[PDB]
Amino acid sequence: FEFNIMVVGQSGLGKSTMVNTLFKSKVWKSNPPGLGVPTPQTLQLHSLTHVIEEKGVKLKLTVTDTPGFGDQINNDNCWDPILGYINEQYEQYLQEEILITRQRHIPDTRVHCCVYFVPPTGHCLRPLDIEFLQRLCRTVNVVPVIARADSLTMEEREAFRRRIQQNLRTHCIDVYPQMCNDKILNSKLRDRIPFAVVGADQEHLVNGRCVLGRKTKWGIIEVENMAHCEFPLLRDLLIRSHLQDLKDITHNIHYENYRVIRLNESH
Ligand SMILES: Nc1nc2c(ncn2[C@@H]2O[C@H](COP(=O)(O)OP(=O)(O)NP(=O)(O)O)[C@@H](O)[C@H]2O)c(=O)[nH]1
Ligand SMILES: [Mg+2]
């Protein structure tokens, strides 16, 4: 039924474009029309909702788009609006439970997974992103990705991925899937995280087939082709393979911890 995700990261990393790519993926039975217009810089936090379907199963997918950070001289406390929105949904869910005349089914607007966009510098994790991820992973599931990965070669993607994984362990950033016998499947996923993804809101004719891609002066970058980028790995993780596992952790771990602290401090 319901599933909510949110894109977070530095400004100019294709977060808004990735929102359109998730809804326009050719895996679903139908897609919204092609955009064909430059998306302006996101100034306000806003959520998009649409019902997608695959294999006859409908899903009410909600994606929250956020304004990018990291453009000021001093970016201190730039995580407050995003952390505030995450806790706002936990408070809404709690107030719906304690309502004396509460409805049968509680509307769930809690963020079930956060997609964190990392700049494709090719070096290591930035101190600004380290501070952001450490605060994020305490309250929400986080899956990091290498944004606009076509700016790096395949060799550069892998070397950058390994260096990101090194300082993730060094700074104790437990991203999803957390380490807490199917370890072989999650080890394969943790090997590829952060995914090297590419966004696209346009359809192009390549090899006689209509596919999503970015048209440049040298070729078409097919975003749903594993030979070009790893967007199918992110799409299958969020929507297909680990959808319920993300919701179970959000309700039983993250929201439960928020609810316990809220009720204990009120006696
Ligand atoms: N090379 C490349 N460019 C991309 C990709 N995705 C988006 N872009 C381009 O990058 C620019 C910024 O896109 P946008 O989605 O607005 O970024 P944003 O993170 O939403 N910015 P903001 O957070 O400030 O709103 C646009 O020109 C867009 O076409 C990608 O995968 N690769
Ligand atoms: Mg944007």
Residue numbers in the entry: 48 to 227, 233 to 319
Copied sentences from the primary study:
Septins are GTP-binding proteins that are involved in important cellular processes such as cytokinesis, membrane trafficking and microtubule dynamics. Many of these biological functions are dependent on the intrinsic ability of septins to spontaneously polymerize into filaments, which subsequently assemble into higher order structures such as rings and networks that are capable of membrane association. Human septins 3, 9 and 12 are the only members of a specific subgroup of septins that display several unusual features, including the absence of a C-terminal coiled coil. This particular subgroup (the SEPT3 septins) are present in rod-like octameric protofilaments but are lacking in similar hexameric assemblies, which only contain representatives of the three remaining subgroups.
Two structures were obtained in the presence of GMPPNP (in space groups P1 and C2221 at 1.8 and 2.12 Å resolution, respectively) and one with GDP (in space group P1 at 2.19 Å resolution). Both of the P1 structures are isomorphous and have four monomers in the asymmetric unit, whereas the C2221 structure has only one. In structures that contain the GTP analogue the γ-phosphate is anchored by the Mg2+ ion, one water molecule and Ser58 and Lys62 from the P-loop, Thr89 from switch I and Gly115 from switch II. Arg195 replaces the lysine which is normally present, but its side chain continues to pack against the guanine base in a similar fashion. Furthermore, Phe116 (the homologue of Phe128 in SEPT3) is always observed in the buried conformation. Both SEPT12G–GDP and SEPT12G–GMPPNP (space group P1) form filaments within the crystal lattice, employing the NC and G interfaces. In contrast, SEPT12G–GMPPNP (space group C2221) does not. Rather, the monomer of the asymmetric unit forms a G-interface dimer by the application of crystallo­graphic symmetry but this does not extend into filaments via NC interfaces. For this reason, all future discussion will refer to the P1 structure. For example, a unique feature of SEPT12 is the presence of an Arg in the well conserved G4 motif, which becomes 194ARAD197 instead of AKAD as observed in all other human septins. The side chain of Arg195 stacks over one side of the guanine base together with Arg266 on the other side.
